[model samples]
Target: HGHINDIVINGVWYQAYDPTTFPYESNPPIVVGWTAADLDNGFVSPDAYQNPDIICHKNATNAKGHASVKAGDTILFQWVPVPWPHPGPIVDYLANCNGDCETVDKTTLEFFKIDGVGLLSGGDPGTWASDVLISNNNTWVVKIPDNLAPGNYVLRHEIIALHSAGQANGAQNYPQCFNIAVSGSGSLQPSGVLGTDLYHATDPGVLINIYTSPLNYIIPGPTVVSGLPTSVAQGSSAATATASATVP
Candidate 1:
């Protein structure tokens, strides 16, 4: 129920799909941005969230090269069959392909939300943000909003997995998309929310339950597009490695 194999940036190591050349496409595979026949590897429930495949998952597209980073780099998504066995709540977004995010026009990109976490701790089945992205080994650290505003950007990582979200189309959503190139400098530039205006399959973090008992989490989408500047980055974690061009 996960995806987005690799992407470290600034610390180097970017390879999200290279099955010996283009197994499914995406050598610029920061995660996804184009060419993704999506052979199975399912997970995208919640009644489609307005389709468009939830922005970037089922057959993603619009990428050719783009994997630089500078405005405080910290991107490191790394996911797989490691430990992210699911609990859920991990989000990050950023659009602004103002120019050439290869071809731009991913339905006129516009996402915005630097990062987001959900539960944290509670009781009867708590601690989420995907269980710290499975003890940080499955990875999920994001940052690159020092002030933002360099150039071409896409990066829209996600993960919902609400166990079974009380039914009615469950809740999985996996979403992934990349094509960065933010060099440095600052200028703010936060104002987005177009993946069909972000979640809404009954929203409540897309139909909640999390086993219940005091877990009142709610982190569906949009709301993280603030004025920027908070610092907080020295180690940032995430550095185990295991998806060097997935295909097995």
Candidate 2:
């Protein structure tokens, strides 16, 4: 299944990651301790890529309570759709847990890419970004970077299935983590890279072969921290992916 469990900030929602009801829920809604067989068998392929469970999947832990958004809020990712019909690319990251992310120390957590999407046009296996998150039902959304410098952060969402990705460990990935608390006074805190240094295992968008089409993808990691304001929806046979605003 597609994992994401539950989320929806500001308008609250939270759920998932229960560890027998998370030490007595009160302000709890952080979501990172994925179990339920790790949320129905979560992923992490591509030869592990430097595993640490690829940062936030398989035995992940950390999430005690936090989601009170502020800086440009729009975080809504509610997956586990039983039919995520994977295709690929849909990333989002942020990591500054400089204070309290429950216990913050998932190896220092230093991610960066704000948002991402892979191939989205051309043909064959083109239109990706997990097919716009399975046509928007499985849901996917991101924002929270208007000024991005209030406080504790984590939000390292991911998904990279790639349909048997040409071979070698056949790409899969799926990561997820959350625990935000940005207030909004903007100071810009960009500069990150650590979830095992972002990506590797032969990253040609993680060994591609999206069936075929004028494809040209490039969304791997690090480098989305500039100008940050994307949303997909600008296809028309283009090769190298590019997004603008609305693709909801």
Candidate 3:
């Protein structure tokens, strides 16, 4: 569980993403080419800072390689530390990178939050307690919708830490994009947004502190892509996926 780069599907080990080029820990908000490091020192701009999500990395897809996980395959995400008290939600997004995720326009890329967990209506120990929710198994997991379209895609997995919520823009975010090729017969193209537009320095969600006042927590962005596209998930693969656009 040491932030290892392999995924477990049906309880078996399969090659996962390797951040050798853009390890989240060491890199800055974005990089220019291949990060080429397994290090974890990665970060993003805070509200106090500039706060942009576009082109989060130099080359989002100079990947180590690719993994083959079809629909229903489960990918697990494990953090190096046991769990820090970030107290927020972890969201998973997918974008059809087309052929090269490296050159895709981040702003046009749409994301359907595959998985997430937040505080309950009642407060106390919110879902943000890392070890409590996501750390229960010591790793967070998401399913590759049983009937998703097949092709090359980039999974944008993000973690928003709201510990410093009291400040205008004290929240911290860690997002890592992985290159993948999903194998499914169904046709469903999820919608997404530019990386830079996901968060705002003055948004109400980013300006509140859970501990200082009532837990008026509102998930920052789009609603979760709950299930497969009804029209596409049940019927034949009608729609086709397009390649990603250049960074805007």
Q: Give TM per candidate.
A: 0.31, 0.31, 0.71
Off by more than 4 A, model 3: 1-6, 12-42, 48-61, 102-108, 129-134, 212-214, 226-248
Per residue, candidate 1 scores C-alpha lDDT tens digits across 153-185 of 788888888888877779888777877778777
lDDT of each: 0.71, 0.71, 0.54
| Top TM-score prediction, candidate number | 3
Q: Which ten residues in a row have the lowest lDDT in candidate 2?
A: 239-248
The TM-score that candidate 1 achieves is 0.31
Error of 3 at 191 (Å): 1.9
RMSD of each: 16.8, 17.0, 8.6
**Which wins on TM-score, candidate 1 or candidate 2?**
2
lDDT tens digits, residues 77-98, model 2? 7676555887888888888988
